[PDB]
Amino acid sequence: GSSHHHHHHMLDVVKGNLIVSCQALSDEPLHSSFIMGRMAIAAKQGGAAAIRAQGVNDINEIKEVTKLPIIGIIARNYDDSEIYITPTMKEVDELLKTDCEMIALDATKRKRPNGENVKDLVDAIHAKGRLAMADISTLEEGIEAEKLGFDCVSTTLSGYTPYSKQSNSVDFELLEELVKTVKIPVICEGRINTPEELKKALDLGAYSAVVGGAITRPQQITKRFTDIL
Amino acid sequence: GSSHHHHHHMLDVVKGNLIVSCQALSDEPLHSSFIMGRMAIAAKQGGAAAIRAQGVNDINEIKEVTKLPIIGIIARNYDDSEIYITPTMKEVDELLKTDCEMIALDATKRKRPNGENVKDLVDAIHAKGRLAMADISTLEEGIEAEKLGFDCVSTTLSGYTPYSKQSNSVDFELLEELVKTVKIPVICEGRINTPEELKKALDLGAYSAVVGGAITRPQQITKRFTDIL
Ligand SMILES: CC(=O)N[C@H](C=O)[C@@H](O)[C@H](O)[C@H](O)COP(=O)(O)O
Ligand SMILES: CC(=O)N[C@H](C=O)[C@@H](O)[C@H](O)[C@H](O)COP(=O)(O)O
Ligand SMILES: [Cl-]
Ligand SMILES: [Cl-]
């Protein structure tokens, strides 16, 4: 098949710019597609180049009210896997019904629900002409993600798997190691709290970066204030 | 008249603690009492001791969903005054129909609408058993606020009047100078962006402090990130 050509392409749009993650799961105070939409508007008006969002309802609302490029995920627990970021083809298919341009998925070394294989997920995303982002936790996972044909890798899961670096701050070391090894874009994502950290990520060769909670989780932002008192 | 005695009193509750301002005016993406209530829940869950809020509808919603103490204001422009933070008795009366425990008002040296006198507003607040906060821009304004019977003074308007220090950062000097000179509590309010600045304000003798946009205005938080790129 064929389609009209667009002038702007998501990876070009986000290069050197900020992607804002606008998520609020069911146990979080801002949980509401309406609210996530308004948070994405705020992000757009503060200069965000793209949005990362969770679930079909939030993705569809954000797309409608901002018209920014979106990295879509579905976060879902399965009884037979530790993976929750877009774990199976079921989630991929659900996301492919939204207009999100990129789909991010856990691309860790771990077994997926139903014993599904990450390559099948990437291929399905590509079969619909969407981009795939590999959320990884280690250097080796990043290298493998490139081999599997992901369009980009993100450091999202560093510190969120038991075998990766345990840290409460941005994993710059993983970022540094990835950029000297893989050729595809490496996106810094996880625990960026300050502009100075964002700047550092880009200075170290991150293609782009994603900030979520330091912008869109006022509970977390509040806590970082109250923790100093 | 008489009333039930409470164990907790607002000034004791906020002493050494953080107050979070949850505001979104009509030109802002989060303008909605629903969203401000959710911001206030987030702030509560993150350790906030009290909330500062604007407008009856937001104040009532925040009180309903958090049960925290509230510093209420009404922001309203008048054609005959530069003052917009609770400028007249009309706004005081509107706020007294809510349960907010403290009312803040501009206590600058400037003429109010209808030639009203700030002392009359303070007295009307006290007559209903509420506390009054003086939002000021200069040291002399802070010194006069105490004389006028305010219960506390805040540095809210420093940098927001033509004759006060113009700055994009917290006015620590005004804070220190008020702490040298007035006996009533001095609240640091305005342009606190980082936990380190919050700590600094308390270390300088602020009784409490208010953080607004750095928690509850994602557009502003996002811009501070994108400005460094
Ligand atoms: C580990 C995991 O589930 N991360 C999720 C991925 O979408 C989100 O919870 C994060 O907010 C996002 O990755 C951005 O990170 P941060 O909020 O730290 O800036
Ligand atoms: C000048 C003025 O109208 N200040 C208002 C006072 O309520 C609010 O816009 C501020 O957000 C609030 O004072 C807290 O300050 P900051 O958002 O800088 O932390
Ligand atoms: Cl939150
Ligand atoms: Cl905002």
Swiss-Prot record, chains A, B:
InterPro entries: Aldolase_TIM, NanE, RibuloseP-bd_barrel. GO terms for biological process: carbohydrate metabolic process; N-acetylmannosamine catabolic process; N-acetylneuraminate catabolic process. Disulfide bonds: none annotated. GO terms for molecular function: N-acylglucosamine-6-phosphate 2-epimerase activity. Its EC number is 5.1.3.9. Gene3D superfamilies: Aldolase class I (3.20.20.70). One of its GO terms (cellular component) is cytosol. It catalyses: an N-acyl-D-glucosamine 6-phosphate = an N-acyl-D-mannosamine 6-phosphate. It holds the Pfam family NanE. Pathway: Amino-sugar metabolism; N-acetylneuraminate degradation; D-fructose 6-phosphate from N-acetylneuraminate: step 3/5. Keywords: Carbohydrate metabolism, Isomerase. Induction: By N-acetylneuraminate. Belongs to the NanE family. HAMAP family: ManNAc6P_epimer. Converts N-acetylmannosamine-6-phosphate (ManNAc-6-P) to N-acetylglucosamine-6-phosphate (GlcNAc-6-P). This is Putative N-acetylmannosamine-6-phosphate 2-epimerase. The lineage of its organism: Bacteria, Bacillati, Bacillota, Clostridia, Eubacteriales.
